[model samples]
Every structure is written in C-alpha cells, then in structure tokens.
Target: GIKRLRRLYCNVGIGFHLQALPDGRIGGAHADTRDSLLELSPVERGVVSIFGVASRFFVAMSSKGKLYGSPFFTDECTFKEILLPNNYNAYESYKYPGMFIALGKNGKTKKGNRVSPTMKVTHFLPRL
Candidate 1:
C-alpha cells in the first residue's frame, strides 16, 4: 500500500477504471487502471498523479468537477483523496473546492459538487 505506483479502481463495474486517454482526456471506463499505474507522492495518505503511464498525459480537473487530461502538470492538476464513510475514496479537486470526481449512473465520469454526502456516485474503491 506504501508503494510509489498505484491504480484507482472506481468500483463502477468490472473493466471500468480511471484512465488518461491518449488524447489527453480523463475517463472512468478503461480496462487498465492497474496497468496504467500512476505515481503518487505524500499527501495525508492520499494519492495524486500528474501523468499516465500508458496514455502519457497529465491529470487535471475543472471547476465543475470535470476530469481532464492536461499535456502539462501544474498545481491545478492536484487532487486530494478524501475517505468517505462508505469505505471508499473520493478524489476532491485541490483547486475546485467541494468538487469531486464522480461517476454518473450512466457509467460516465462527472463532477460531484453536492454539499451533501448522500450521493454515492462520488465514492470509489481500490482494487483488491
């Protein structure tokens, strides 16, 4: 768990994962979250990555909880992983307050800016 490289499995479904596309896009539906491992530093036991191993793009987010793949990494690309009550991790944008990387019911990635924690789409689970 203390390794430098890791993957984020969103628990949406099998083969659905968080990945950076080749065209510098971020999405939650890929077959290779583990294979597309991201590098993590130290931040309150949270994981944040700037680059994608396979896609070769930087990770970023928008003010409206949208995930983006940036060609260059910056402070805005940083995300703080918050542990939710349901034993899942929610990636909150450091630049955009209250915005989380949420998964929609349609199996797509969306921004979760809800003030209430009742929304379960913002939570994600790591692969066992």
Candidate 2:
C-alpha cells in the first residue's frame, strides 16, 4: 500500500470500482472504501496484472474464467488492455482474446465468454 507507483482507480460507474476482497473474492465498492484502490503493475510493455492495494492480492482469472483474488501472482493475473474510442480501457485476459473482464448488474462478475469490448460493462476507466 505504501508503494506509489502509478496507482489507479478502476471505475465501473460513478462510485463503483472493482475491488479485491480480503477473502480472495472480487467485488466492487465506492471510492471511499479501501478496496477500491488498485495498481496496474506492468508485466510487459502494454500488459499488466492488477494488484489490489487494500487486499494485498492480485486480481486473477481462473482456468474456468472465474474472476478472483490471489495472494500469489501467476499468469492468470495478466490482462491486456484495449483502449476504446471513448477512452475507456477494456481488460482482456491474456490467455483468451476477445473475452473481456466484465461486470453485470449489481456488480456481479460476468462470465468471460459472455462479454466483449463492445459491451459497456467491460469498459473500465482506470482514472487516476
């Protein structure tokens, strides 16, 4: 949490941002909440693995494409960011192209196979 290297707020909506729960679950919370803060740690020139500053976990996707938090980093934590014309960033799993990280109504994690960059729910603004 002390590291200040390019922290970001992954905004899903006005107040909701993707959060990593202490129990290895992925969720969303308001900016006022500690879990709302995250870091996009670079693993390559244009790729990154999301790190939860509050929960001390990396946002990882399972082989089944389930979104979760992992205390230890792995390949499942990597994501490729696609920049939209609207300037939103769509995070796609490095292992699965065209499948974007998306959230459904009530902040539910949408299935990877059920989403794409065209879906608004998959678009996140990693605003500072």
Candidate 3:
C-alpha cells in the first residue's frame, strides 16, 4: 500500500510535535509545537529540518547522539523521516550515526541512541 506523506504531529505530551527551541535544544512541547505550523524545510534529498514554528529554531543532532536546538539551521539540523512497520514515524539524524528523536516512558522527548528496533520508547504515533 502506498502511504501518503504528510506532516506528523507526534503524540507525546498533549499533542507535542517534534520541534526545536531557539536555545539549541531538541524537544517539543504542546506550547512549542502548536503554533504557526508549516512545511518543514528539506536539508537534502529525503532529509528534513525539525523546525519549530513558534520558537523559530532548528533541531540538531550531536555526533554523540544528543538532540538539541539551534537558532541557525545547519547540516546538524538534518533528519530523515523514516516510516516504521507499525505505521509510525521515526526521525533519524542525518549527522549522527544511531541517534533518533524518541519519546521516553514519561512522555518526554529524548535521544534514542542505543535503543533496539523493538523498543517501544522510540516509537511515535501521529495524532490527526
């Protein structure tokens, strides 16, 4: 089946979407994810920027597999949106080796650097 590509609203905390802050941090809250939503910029073929509309920041990945945000959009802000077998989405950093944007058991966003393929904590669902 051919699945339509669309912007995904990550079902983390209160409809939190994957976004970045101006302070160079890679975490999205409802307050940060809910405003001025628009098309994410593509850094290259198949890789896109995890940008925040309200914060006006770009999400970045560290070489050590850490997630952060930056005021400037650069190569570090690149991430490939990967579709999982379960119909969910995973954002893997283009720069980092094994880092992915993931949610913790407490619904907080984190860097899934060492998570296995079956780890539920690294999975995310789209809400509406």
* TM-score top scorer: 2
User: What ranges in model 3 sit over 4 Å off?
Assistant: 1-16, 28-38, 126-128
**How does model 1 fare in lDDT?**
0.65
Give Cα-based local distance difference scores for all models: 0.65, 0.74, 0.61
Tell me the tens digit of each residue's lDDT in model 3 across 1-128: 32332335555445555555555455545543443243466656777775666667666777876766677778788888777876876778787756777755454566557664356555655543
lDDT of 1 by residue, 1-128 (tens): 56455566665544355667788777766555532566655544564754677776767887766677887777667878777775777777878777777666555667556533446666666653
User: What lDDT, from 0 to 1, does candidate 2 have?
Assistant: 0.74
Residue 84 of model 1 has an lDDT of 77
Lowest-sum lDDT 10-residue window in model 3: 1-10
Tell me the tens digit of each residue's lDDT in model 2 across 1-128. 24333333344554457778899888766554677578787788668888888889998886667888989988889999778876778888887666667776566677777776887778776655
Q: How do all models score by TM-score?
A: 0.75, 0.85, 0.70
N/CA/C clash count, model 3: 2
